[PDB]
Design a protein around this ligand. Structure first.
Ligand SMILES: O=C(O)[C@H]1O[C@@H](O)[C@H](O)[C@@H](O)[C@H]1O
Ligand SMILES: [Mg+2]
Length: 356
């Protein structure tokens, strides 16, 4: 089935007519719904005893274009406590103006020094932006028994307990804790971004953690930006069966039963409002369900409009390589699933508008 629940009708049926009601009544309702039925509850906020050790600082990386820092973010005072490694490139030209750089923060899938994977780090830097990354497997190994060797392990797990997407997302927020202590970056101007499974975590981190200034979802698909109730491409039963550690056990109640869902992903997107949000698809990426990613944006737009922000105009998918929307923005690009220089060019212009 497929009737979408209204972001702007509360659980008790009252109509959300103002931003205060949205901020302090409706948002907590949706956050707790997504936590309980989909991603699982985030248990730890900031742990006590987090320690940041800057292990490497190189002031003339990439030809003097960038400063590169390597940072262990340790999650306890003990020196052999669990940790993650954050890689940061800062543009030198911005440091030379005595300004903290705005930052693109995203998880990587193959390791910090694979960005197999490559992002246009040099272009991002050339455009005046810092780049930070953490390998997702320092937080939760992407495998079905992966939570036992993960930050969440330090007869089973509870049905509303978080999986890998929630642990990855919590990792992004801890990366932001670090960025707040780093005088070369403006932690109030952080674009949190992700591709595919890591875009699911980027969305979930941006909705829970409203410190993030900008949120970018690149082809995050099922249980990211795509409407589950559309039953197109990847389905809930497919994703929980192949990746049973990603979501909460409770998400499996919705296996082949998306009609029963009490929310859909347009409401995840609405939790970014009023902060700028970018959802993007690939034209041949039927698995992620591009129309469903676009329609989730459109069904989220009323919440942005409550704050006077606008989304893609038109009620169907805009032409390829034509981004559309104000603070709430979409593009679809030609070709297959991935993250490309085309996507990044559109993201950088969006950031130029909202972070510089
Ligand atoms: O790109 C990938 O490997 C993944 O992308 C995700 O968004 C999708 O849910 C996975 O099934 C897999 O296709
Ligand atoms: Mg789908």
């Amino acid at each position: 089935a497929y009737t979408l629940p209204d972001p702007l009708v509360g659980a008790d049926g009252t109509r959300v007519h103002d931003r205060a009601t949205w901020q302090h009544r409706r948002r907590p309702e949706l956050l707790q719904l997504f936590a309980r039925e989909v991603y699982g509850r985030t248990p730890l906020g900031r742990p006590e005893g987090m320690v940041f050790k800057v292990t490497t600082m190189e002031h003339a990386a990439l030809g003097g274009a960038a400063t590169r820092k390597e940072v262990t973010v340790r999650f306890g005072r003990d020196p052999n406590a669990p940790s993650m490694q954050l890689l940061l490139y800062v543009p030198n030209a911005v440091i030379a103006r005595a300004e903290r750089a705005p930052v693109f923060l995203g998880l990587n899938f193959y390791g910090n020094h694979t960005v197999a994977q490559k992002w246009p780090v040099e272009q991002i830097l050339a455009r005046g932006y810092a780049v930070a990354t953490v390998y997702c497997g320092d937080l939760c190994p992407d495998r079905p028994d992966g939570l036992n060797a993960s930050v969440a392990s330090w007869d089973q797990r509870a049905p509303d307990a978080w999986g890998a997407i929630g642990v990855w997302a919590w990792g992004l927020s801890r990366a932001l804790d670090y960025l707040e202590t780093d005088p070369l970056v403006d932690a109030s101007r952080v674009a949190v971004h992700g591709h595919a499974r890591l875009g699911k975590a980027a969305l979930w981190a941006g909705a829970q953690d409203d410190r993030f200034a900008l949120v970018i979802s690149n082809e995050s698909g099922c249980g990211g930006a795509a409407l589950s109730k559309r039953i197109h491409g990847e389905t809930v039963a497919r994703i929980n069966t192949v990746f049973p550690h990603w979501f909460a056990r409770n998400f499996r109640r919705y296996d082949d039963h998306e009609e029963a869902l009490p929310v859909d992903q347009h409401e995840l997107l609405a939790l970014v409002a009023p902060r700028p949000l970018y959802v993007a698809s690939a034209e041949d990426d039927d698995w992620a369900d591009p129309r469903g990613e676009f329609l989730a944006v459109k069904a989220a737009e009323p919440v942005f409009r409550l704050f006077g922000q606008t989304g893609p105009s038109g009620e169907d998918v805009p032409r390829v390589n034509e981004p559309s929307g104000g603070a709430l923005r979409y593009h679809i690009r030609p070709g297959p699933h991935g993250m490309t220089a085309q996507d990044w060019a559109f993201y950088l212009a969006f950031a130029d508008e909202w972070l510089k």
